[PDB]
């Protein structure tokens, strides 16, 4: 609504400025306004959208984890009762986090996914849909936790299936999707074996395709492959 009176190109130009200023909340609002213009996003605009919310939500997740750890320590045997403040403030941060995830999932469903027919757009948006359901799952504790997890799984799975059919094993989006789906396996779905196998198979298949790349594509793919390697090193 709020960015309704600004030109699409102006909102894009301003998202890039807000990125430069590390003003990620602003960046995210500008890109939400740009999506709400109703036109499809270019590659670079998809990247701006994803970086804006990634940073916003990444700050909320880190805060929620600081607060969750405090809360847990207060619930330990021998801890002094300090009343409801930690739980209230964790719940506040948690609610704001869920609101951001719902807003991104809303933009995806209305109407980015349905108009995305190329592999690179459609896999990109489905990966984001898996990511934001995953951030939901990180804080979920009630009746819907299983459905949240399975919505993350299903979105990552359809992205995987398209990426396997339509993209080279070294494509950065294919590689980043597999990195995140492997994290989902490891710490959300309690399947560390699947997490490891996925990261390993993904890394190995990318290695064998490096030879097809220019030096700049090489750089782009190996950057992500290292994050796969970092996880395998941590997990094994």
């Amino acid at each position: 609504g709020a960015m309704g009176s600004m030109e699409r190109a102006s909102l894009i130009q301003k998202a890039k400025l807000a990125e430069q200023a590390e003003r990620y909340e602003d960046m995210a609002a500008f890109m939400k306004g740009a999506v709400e213009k109703g036109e499809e996003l270019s590659n670079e605009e998809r990247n701006l959208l994803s970086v804006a919310y990634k940073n916003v939500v990444g700050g909320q997740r880190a805060a929620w984890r600081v607060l969750s750890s405090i809360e847990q320590k207060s619930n330990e045997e021998g801890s002094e009762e300090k009343g409801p403040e930690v739980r209230e403030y964790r719940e506040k941060v948690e609610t704001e986090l869920q609101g951001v995830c719902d807003t991104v999932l809303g933009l995806l469903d209305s109407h980015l996914i349905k108009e995305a027919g190329d592999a690179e757009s459609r896999v990109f948006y489905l990966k984001m849909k898996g990511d934001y359901y995953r951030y939901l799952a990180e804080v979920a504790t009630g009746d819907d936790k299983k459905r949240i997890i399975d919505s993350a799984r299903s979105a990552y799975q359809e992205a995987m299936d398209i990426s396997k059919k339509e993209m080279p094993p070294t494509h950065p989006i294919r590689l980043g999707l597999a990195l995140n789906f492997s994290v989902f396996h490891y710490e959300i779905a309690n399947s560390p074996e699947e997490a490891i196998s996925l990261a390993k198979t993904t890394f190995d298949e990318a290695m064998a395709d490096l030879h097809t790349l220019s030096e700049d594509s090489y750089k782009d793919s190996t950057l992500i492959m290292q994050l796969l390697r970092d996880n395998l090193t941590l997990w094994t």
């Binding site: 990511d131 980043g176 990195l179 796969l228 970092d230 996880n231 997990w235």
Partner: peptide
């Protein structure tokens, strides 16, 4: 230290 995502 913390696993990577992107």
């Amino acid at each position: 230290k913390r696993r990577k995502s992107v």
